[PDB]
Amino acid sequence: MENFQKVEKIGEGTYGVVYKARNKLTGEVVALKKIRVPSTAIREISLLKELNHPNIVKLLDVIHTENKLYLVFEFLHQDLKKFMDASALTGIPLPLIKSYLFQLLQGLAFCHSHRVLHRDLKPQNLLINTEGAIKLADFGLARAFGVPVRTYTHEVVTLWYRAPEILLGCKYYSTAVDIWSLGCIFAEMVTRRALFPGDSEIDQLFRIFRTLGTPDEVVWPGVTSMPDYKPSFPKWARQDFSKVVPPLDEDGRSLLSQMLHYDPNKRISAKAALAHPFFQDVTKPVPHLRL
Numbered sequence: 001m002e003n004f005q006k007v008e009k010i011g012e013g014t015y016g017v018v019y020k021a022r023n024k025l026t027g028e029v030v031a032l033k034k035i036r037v038p039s040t041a042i043r044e045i046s047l048l049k050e051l052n053h054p055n056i057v058k059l060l061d062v063i064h065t066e067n068k069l070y071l072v073f074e075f076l077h078q079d080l081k082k083f084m085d086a087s088a089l090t091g092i093p094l095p096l097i098k099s100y101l102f103q104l105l106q107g108l109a110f111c112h113s114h115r116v117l118h119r120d121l122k123p124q125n126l127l128i129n130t131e132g133a134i135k136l137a138d139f140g141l142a143r144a145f146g147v148p149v150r151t152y153t154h155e156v157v158t159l160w161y162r163a164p165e166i167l168l169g170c171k172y173y174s175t176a177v178d179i180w181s182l183g184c185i186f187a188e189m190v191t192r193r194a195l196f197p198g199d200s201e202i203d204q205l206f207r208i209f210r211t212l213g214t215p216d217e218v219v220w221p222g223v224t225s226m227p228d229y230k231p232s233f234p235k236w237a238r239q240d241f242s243k244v245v246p247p248l249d250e251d252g253r254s255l256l257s258q259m260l261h262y263d264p265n266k267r268i269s270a271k272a273a274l275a276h277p278f279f280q281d282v283t284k285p286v287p288h289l290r291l
């Protein structure tokens with residue numbers, strides 16, 4: 001760690017503090033993360049250093065010293081959460097939403113092809129630069145250190161982007177969980193409001209049900225035998241997407257519906273999503289960032 005000079009506290013992640021830092025040797029400006037000895041974690045994280053892609057925040061270095069783990073990441077200057085908050089008055093223009101979605105799906109398709117999932121996508125871990133790129137941060141960290149209810153600061157970990165199979169207690173969930181989360185973020189970029197802002201697991205589930213309909217054996221074979229499924233769940237009818245994400249056009253609503261399929265086996269893959277007609281006219285606009 002002596003090789004790094006902390007510039008500033010960026011914030012507090014799930015596992016530890018995140019610092020903006022300078023490498024005293026390379027001159028590099030970086031995101032330095034403190035993770036709150038386990039050899040299985042070392043080995044997992046070392047596999048991540050290999051998983052390199054332009055829409056994945058690069059893991060530069062893993063440093064295990066004194067019973068302590070530090071991850072050194074590529075640094076980006078702004079996150080999607082703050083960008084959305086700053087664009088709240090007129091919205092992010094559709095061509096930019098589409099470009100970001102497209103790039104994030106390329107990110108997922110890559111990781112998923114290597115059997116690596118994120119599990120905790122959220123606006124705060126999607127990072128953007130001045131050139132119009134967006135990148136997924138902290139990929140793979142969840143299978144290394146788990147997802148707690150509270151962070152080390154007791155901050156509440158958000159449920160808003162959590163897939164229904166996780167909430168229903170599936171232990172062996174798939175890459176489809178990341179597609180669900182990205183669908184939720186897509187809807188939020190469009191409407192400028194979170195799609196399912198649950199404040200407990202049941203509230204999260206019940207918000208999902210109220211918009212997409214309570215799932216049953218017709219739309220999701222196997223659903224009623226999931227660990228946390230209860231026959232006593234209220235039965236809500238599904239809303240039309242035209243009501244859920246106006247003014248998203250038919251191509252967008254079509255794609256979003258496939259990202260939000262209940263059955264993870266029906267839910268569109270990242271690769272198939274990249275071929276959806278929504279992306280026919282996709283471009284790469286540059287955002288206006290005040291840094």
Ligand SMILES: CC(C)c1nc2c(OCC3CCCCC3)nc(N)nc2[nH]1
Nearest residue numbers: 018031073074075076077078079124125
């Ligand atoms: C200057 C701000 C926008 C910033 N944050 C970064 C970051 O992660 C910090 C967050 C990760 C997700 C959870 C909250 C902290 N990770 C990386 N690599 N760069 C960042 N740049």
